[PDB]
Amino acid sequence: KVTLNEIVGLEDVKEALKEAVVYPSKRPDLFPLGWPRGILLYGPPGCGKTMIAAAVANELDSEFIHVDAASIMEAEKNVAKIFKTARELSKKENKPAIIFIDELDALLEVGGEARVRNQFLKEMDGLADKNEISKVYVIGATNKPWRLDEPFLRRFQKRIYITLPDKAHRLELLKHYSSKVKLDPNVNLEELAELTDGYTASDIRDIVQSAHMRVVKEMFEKNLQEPRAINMDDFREVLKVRKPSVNQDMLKAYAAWHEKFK
Amino acid sequence: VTLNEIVGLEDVKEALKEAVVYPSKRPDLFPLGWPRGILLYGPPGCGKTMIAAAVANELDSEFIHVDAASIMSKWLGEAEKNVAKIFKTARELSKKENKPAIIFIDELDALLASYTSEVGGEARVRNQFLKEMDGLADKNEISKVYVIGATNKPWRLDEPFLRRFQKRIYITLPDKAHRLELLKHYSSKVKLDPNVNLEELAELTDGYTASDIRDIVQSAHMRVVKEMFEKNLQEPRAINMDDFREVLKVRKPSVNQDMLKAYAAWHEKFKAL
Amino acid sequence: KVTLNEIVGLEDVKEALKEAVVYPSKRPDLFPLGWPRGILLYGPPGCGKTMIAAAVANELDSEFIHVDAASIMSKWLGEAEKNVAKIFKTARELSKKENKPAIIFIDELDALLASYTSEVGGEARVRNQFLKEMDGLADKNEISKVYVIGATNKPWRLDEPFLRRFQKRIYITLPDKAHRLELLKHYSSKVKLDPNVNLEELAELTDGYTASDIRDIVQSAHMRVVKEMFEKNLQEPRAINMDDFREVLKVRKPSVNQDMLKAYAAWHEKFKAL
Amino acid sequence: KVTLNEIVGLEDVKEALKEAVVYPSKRPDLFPLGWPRGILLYGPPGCGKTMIAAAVANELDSEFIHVDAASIMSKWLGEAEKNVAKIFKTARELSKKENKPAIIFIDELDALLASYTSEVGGEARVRNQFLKEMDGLADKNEISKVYVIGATNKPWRLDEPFLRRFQKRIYITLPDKAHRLELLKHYSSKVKLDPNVNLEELAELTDGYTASDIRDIVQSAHMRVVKEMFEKNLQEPRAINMDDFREVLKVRKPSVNQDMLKAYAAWHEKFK
Amino acid sequence: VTLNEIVGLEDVKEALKEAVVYPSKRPDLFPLGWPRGILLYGPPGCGKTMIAAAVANELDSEFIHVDAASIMSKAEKNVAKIFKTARELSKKENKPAIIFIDELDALLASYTSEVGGEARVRNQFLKEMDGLADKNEISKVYVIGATNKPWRLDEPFLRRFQKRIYITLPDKAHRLELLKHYSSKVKLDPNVNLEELAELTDGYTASDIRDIVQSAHMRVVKEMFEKNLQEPRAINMDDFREVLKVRKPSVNQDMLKAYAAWHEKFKAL
Amino acid sequence: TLNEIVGLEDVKEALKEAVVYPSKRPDLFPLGWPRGILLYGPPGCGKTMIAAAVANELDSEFIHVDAASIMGEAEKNVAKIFKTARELSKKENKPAIIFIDELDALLEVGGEARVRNQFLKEMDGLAISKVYVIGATNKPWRLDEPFLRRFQKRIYITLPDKAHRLELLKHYSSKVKLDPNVNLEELAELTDGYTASDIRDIVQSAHMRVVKEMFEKNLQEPRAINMDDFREVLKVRKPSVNQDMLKAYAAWHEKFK
């Protein structure tokens, strides 16, 4: 159960994902010059690229063949099977199957490179338009597109920068991660959102979790029945110590690669 | 898809004719011979691949297409087996029927790297290939076969490699008149709506490669399909001129102003022609 | 045999260990955003990161599956994978219906990132198999319960993927004055000490020494006295004096170099995570 | 080659080749401290080092065992040793009782120092086997006679052991004005030239071009004229004019970059 | 070749006794135990190898000698065996065995397969020393490591050698008994007065004393055969004088400051 | 014999010291004597000819091997080279001398260690008696601190002094008709800094000067050689040993005597 509720906002990113995949599914005839089956989600880590890609499969009541490139690194037997089954699972029932690759970086001594990598690279040239069949997509996810190699890179024509979340994005996160921790007024999430400039969505969950943990520590070593109501100065003290997980230089390194490989 | 000019780039075109179509039609006229190695270098997207296809079809000729990426990664140590075969078959397919065959190499840059592990990836496969071109010259006549190499990164290209391509044609970023016929060809079948006047777009798109024209129209048409969805409807909206306007604020030329100066440098200093 | 009543490290280290592991054990419902199963003990060596982790198992009447990363790399063969899956296997299994949480302890966590032969079975094969196991602890059809305490003196070695399957990281700091005292007591244990010694003023003289090189300082002070009995030719050893500690404390310095102290302190601030 | 052709390269190149090889052939007794059998032709590319070395064999009615170092590395995976010994084998053999000295010529000498697969067999195995062969040419009073002319555009690659089995090193320099003239003649050969062309002032206009990119300049000037006939639709080509050379000489520059020129010049002075 | 002060250097010696001869003679007296790893570090030539032999023979003990060079190039199989046999050779007969490692530095480099070089063989060995501690008693076996380059020595390696003895460049009184021991059998001639040599040889290692006398004696044999006698002449003061102009100390003044630094920051005890 | 190289005494007496004495009179060396001997210096000084001189001083066998050549096994040969040298040192106590040209060249699993430690071991073995190993190198940088300690005797074959050069200039004048006015002495001192190798070159190239003449002049006989021949050939030809290699040797020399 994870439709387009969904991630919290992010529209820009989202409509560009629709554009790539939801439309040619709904109406292929409208794309005479075709449309690319390879799609790349690149950005700082924690922004939960894995959850976004799940959202599009469920938008299309579609199968979501998830694989972590770590594990899959023969091993040729598996890489052909992952496509195999996705095409197969795209039955006469034109339900498009979505293959999702976590840590795409990790696909990059004779058998390590090439053997398993070109076998996979080839598979994507195949998705194009061999006697129609059609349907199957590949969403690759990476926090390190530096690793990504100029051949690899051209079997992913659609590349969407999952950006670090803006102030308005954070707010609805801070809401969604407040969800069920009894919050106490005086907290005013809005001023947090803006205090949390530069944090990924991952290390927001952390912030709240560690703030709420603050309160549970009290109940135990105070010996209260119930936790304390979670205060604003909880966030303040936890926000001194916890910093953004994405370093200012990684931020300039992404920004560079982004403009040179749109 | 013959040499009607894929699109009115004349300058480029006549220099390609010069290199290949003439010696085919009339070799006796070239007593000092003529070079079989020919290099298409410039910013990417200008579709060097389509141009080279045009010359084969100008000569009712075979077009042996190969991406240098694959020939490096995709085999093993003995990716030598394939590089000799590519020439093999092109000569063979240049039968008694003096139909000249054209080998086209996408990403020529890629023969100079991509070895990963086992030893060099250099020399073994590269000199085998470099040798093959010395062979095209004039070994017991036979003749006929050409090599069109394509690259967006002639920096990579190495001063030995370079000299088995004596004919070098800068495929330049397309001029206003070129663009127009592209904008036409990529409008082809997207219901366009009057008020659009392609001419003033062609001139608005100064500095874009031919690749990121297809993008601009595709993304403008995508604008109209986005509307149809959740409003519903089976035809989309009629594609407007302010579509192009808003899409043209966000989408910029894919070829960076510094790459433009880097090509221009290498063009003047390495490339006589 | 050694529960987490514990002697001193409250302020920081111990309560931060409780926080991580003892609470979610006693009361999981109180953590709706869950809680991390991977927990990292990083600091200068000698502070006995191994004895601390034992303390939390015995706090939870819990099993303590101890493994040295050295052995799991060198020992076995190519299929040292067989062992790494078994270590988790048995810990889950031994976390029976009896919701007693099992605690895997990894000495020298650094050592999973090198020490092989067939370049390619060395890395990845065994390392990702292990890295994967920890993603598994999270929340696969509940089961729950099992933890991983990794210990290291060299978190520089530690690698940014590895690092993120240990979300709880506790700097086991060089021991404070109050800590030392109860060590100096525990290592005096049975060496006839002689009054005039007053351990308190030692504890404060031994600012900057690890717990390891306290045992050394007393052992070498007591050795001072045995040297006497022999080359003096006395029948008992001498009673161990205070000026023993003084002259042994000139020569023996802290084992943790002032630069390794700045190197920890750096890594600490750039990879904090409570 | 028939007096060893007076192509022009007198002071410097040719006499220095004669010096090395033609004299000890004609009159060994005159060299009591012996004379080196390894001889290196190093310079910018295109100057046709391969044609020069042919000239010396034909000066001595001598055999010219030509081998490209590329091929000898590539073929016969590991046992490309079999060929390298055979090349010398045959050259000594072909230097029969008939004291005709044989000349081995090695194109791209640089290429013996790379281009392999198995770490251990690439270097050493084939390279020392070859290096050893040259120590053999010295004397062991078995045969004498055989020489090795190595050719390279990249003597940087050349390695300080390799280097010392070539004691005679001749910089084949970019061709002088007088040299060019007889090239411009030889490459005019059969392209109907038209008076008004006066090759002499071209030779001096083409200062800094290698011999290779002179063939290019004329070929591309003649191509100028054929382009006319076609798009003009004339029945013959046009007669090749002087302003052809002029407009082709704006665009075509020397193929040897001014920095390569300083890099050779450096290596030249540090390894005479 | 026991000790007793067979070489005449005490400070070093009593600190070696302290470490090893006492716990052998009377373990009960050490309740906090005693370290089995012991490190001999200093300038080269001072013959660390002969010193360590002396303690084995002090204890009628076995002396398992191994050069770390060989164990690297010429390997896990052997490193376990070296300990294996030393424990085994420490039979019910509580005769403590002593493993001696020449060039301890050499366990930290070598190799061929980067990764079997480090760790594989090094940690196997490092583990072995944690084992000597007190696994179900057994006890007895020691490890004397020798090095001229403790810079190489690595802060983990270092801490399985808790006893570290700086074998210092030999003092004037030490040298004398060397000059005696290396005159041993070269017919010396009066006029020579070894005492004033000992003090002339300030700053030389014990190694380059053997050299100085050998090369002085060589002076006299060269005469024989440049002059043509059947035995040597010969042997005299002024030989030493001329040979002492040319031959200098083998231990450079900067190595001297580098040891001295590493010694202070930080030697144990 | 010891004619021999021409006259380098210093070097020579230090070679005698190492090898000729313990051969004639071992009893005089109670602390033994080293069997491994290293000849290190700039190239061309003909280390190979010097080592031949000591074998012939001892009417001794001279097992010559280039480390280039001896580099899948190759272990078979390295054991055989010692084998035969010990064997050839028969009951007849004639000491055999193994000479290794380019010792540097002994330094993927089989390349290092396999053949190298097999060889390193052989020298620990020499410690029967009789057999020696003279290793030669122009690049003792390559030489490795284990290798290096199985060669306890190390003699810097220095760039040849003025008196040395003279008898070379004589020996390489040997048979080229020289012409008075030449006065070799002032050449020897003009040739400060040249190796013995690039003396042979100097004369050979000076004599070649004269043969040039005969040919392009068309004389019957060469011209007589000269003095200003040497002068012009000495402008162009410089020492083959670079001033930096000179400082690099000098460094290694003092740090590894």
Numbering used by the authors:
A (entry chain E): 96 to 168, 174 to 208, 214 to 367
B (entry chain D): 97 to 369
C (entry chain F): 96 to 369
D (entry chain C): 96 to 367
E (entry chain A): 97 to 170, 175 to 369
F (entry chain B): 98 to 168, 173 to 208, 214 to 233, 238 to 367
Quote the passages of the study that discuss this structure, keeping the authors' original sentences:
Vps4, a member of the type-I or meiotic clade of AAA family of proteins (ATPase associated with various activities)11 disassembles ESCRT-III polymers from membranes, which might be coupled to the membrane fission reaction itself. Proteins homologous to Vps4 and ESCRT-III are also present in the Crenarchaeota phylum of archaea where they catalyse final steps in cell division, virus budding and vesicle release. Vps4 contains an amino-terminal microtubule interacting and trafficking (MIT) domain that interacts with carboxy-terminal peptide motifs termed MIT domain-interacting motif in activated eukaryotic and archaeal ESCRT-III proteins. Here we characterized the oligomeric state of the Vps4 homologue from M. sedula (MsVps4) that belongs to the phylum Crenarchaeota.
The structure of MsVps4ΔMIT was solved by molecular replacement and single-wavelength anomalous diffraction (SAD) techniques, and the model was refined to a resolution of 3.6 Å. The asymmetric unit of the P212121 space group contained one hexameric ring structure composed of the typical large ATPase domain and the small ATPase domain with its C-terminal helix packed against the large domain of the neighbouring protomer. The 13 amino acid linker sequence plus 6 N-terminal residues that form a short β-strand (β′) in mammalian VPS4A and B are disordered in all protomers. The orientation of the large ATPase domain with respect to the small one is the same in all six protomers and their Cα atoms superimpose with a root mean squared deviation of 0.62 Å. The ring structure has twofold symmetry where opposing protomers make similar interactions. Three different protomer–protomer interfaces were identified between molecules A–B, B–C and C–D (interface D–E is the same as A–B; E–F corresponds to B–C and F–A to C–D), which are generated by a 10° and 15° rotation of the large ATPase domains in the different dimers. Each protomer–protomer interface can be split into two interacting surfaces, the conserved hydrophobic (H) interface between the small ATPase domain and the large ATPase domain from the neighbouring protomer, and the variable (V) interface between two large ATPase domains from neighbouring protomers. The V interface is dominated by polar interactions that vary substantially between the three different interprotomer interfaces. Superpositioning of the hexamer on itself by stepwise 60° rotations reveals the extensive conformational space that the pseudohexamer can adopt via its V and H interface in the absence of nucleotide. The nucleotide-binding cleft is open and accessible to nucleotides in all protomers of the apo structure.
